[PDB]
Amino acid sequence: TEVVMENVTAFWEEGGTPVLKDINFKIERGQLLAVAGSTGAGKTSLLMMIMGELEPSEGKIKHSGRISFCSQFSWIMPGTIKENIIFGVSYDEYRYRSVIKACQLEEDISKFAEKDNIVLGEGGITLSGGQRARISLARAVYKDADLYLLDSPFGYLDVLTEKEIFESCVCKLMANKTRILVTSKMEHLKKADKILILHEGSSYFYGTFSELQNLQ
Numbered sequence: 777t778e779v780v781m782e783n784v785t786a787f788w789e790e791g792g793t794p795v796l797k798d799i800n801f802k803i804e805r806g807q808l809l810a811v812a813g814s815t816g817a818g819k820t821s822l823l824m825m826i827m828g829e830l831e832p833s834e835g836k837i838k839h840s841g842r843i844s845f846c847s848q849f850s851w852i853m854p855g856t857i858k859e860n861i862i863f864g865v866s867y868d869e870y871r872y873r874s875v876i877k878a879c880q881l882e883e884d885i886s887k888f889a890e891k892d893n894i895v896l897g898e899g900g901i902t903l904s905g906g907q908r909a910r911i912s913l914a915r916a917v918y919k920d921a922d923l924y925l926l927d928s929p930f931g932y933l934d935v936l937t938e939k940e941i942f943e944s945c946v947c948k949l950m951a952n953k954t955r956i957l958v959t960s961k962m963e964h965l966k967k968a969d970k971i972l973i974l975h976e977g978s979s980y981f982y983g984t985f986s987e988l989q990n991l992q
């Protein structure tokens with residue numbers, strides 16, 4: 777699917793300050809939009825609008841079909857690591873294994889005696905912050921959808937691991953998928969088809985990394 781926002785303004789609380797102000801962008805089918813900005817700038821709120829949780833007061837929004845959402849807060853439910861990634865979707869060995877590999881979870885899983893059947897969220901193993909984040913990412917990426925909304929999914933990862941998973945998962949495995957990635961890392965912005973930088977709800981910059989470079 778493509779995604780369009782045109783002159784979008786929105787409020788979480790009627791009669792308050794707007795959380796998003798005159799936002800404009802367009803993603804073609806299969807492109808990657810990177811959304812940057814400081815804390816509170818409105819990045820997650822932008823994703824909430826696409827998911828229908830926040831309604832616009834002005835402007836137009838276009839997008840169509842199933843959404844897969846990866847929250848910036850990683851989470852696990854009681855069940856195996858395989859169950860947490862599949863999370864109710866039909867199982868396919870090749871699809872599952874390719875997601876695991878792209879999220880670098882094969883190394884972790886290979887070290888468990890129960891492999892993919894290690895049980896999480898029941899007081900047995902307590903996973904690291906980075907393991908929980910990669911599992912949450914793998915869960916969102918395994919789901920088949922027309923639009924993937926990945927809200928700062930690389931929590932607790934070191935910068936090289938983050939870079940490698942951005943490349944293996946977001947850029948290679950998901951190459952033909954329409955993606956919105958909330959991220960502030962320079963290499964991610966460099967590889968994105970478009971970049972949207974938010975500041976206090978407003979569009980600080982919108983365009984390509986090359987266009988931002990030319991302003992220097």
Ligand SMILES: Nc1ncnc2c1ncn2[C@@H]1O[C@H](COP(=O)(O)OP(=O)(O)OP(=O)(O)O)[C@@H](O)[C@H]1O
Pocket residue numbers: 788789795813814815816817818819820821822848
């Ligand atoms: N469900 C919500 N209901 C009411 N207000 C919200 C809600 N979600 C976010 N807000 C408020 O919207 C404003 C923008 O917050 P938002 O979560 O979109 O920023 P963010 O860019 O995602 O920040 P961060 O980088 O820390 O995740 C904040 O003032 C926040 O308190």
Ligand SMILES: [Mg+2]
Pocket residue numbers: 819820821848927
């Ligand atoms: Mg957020």
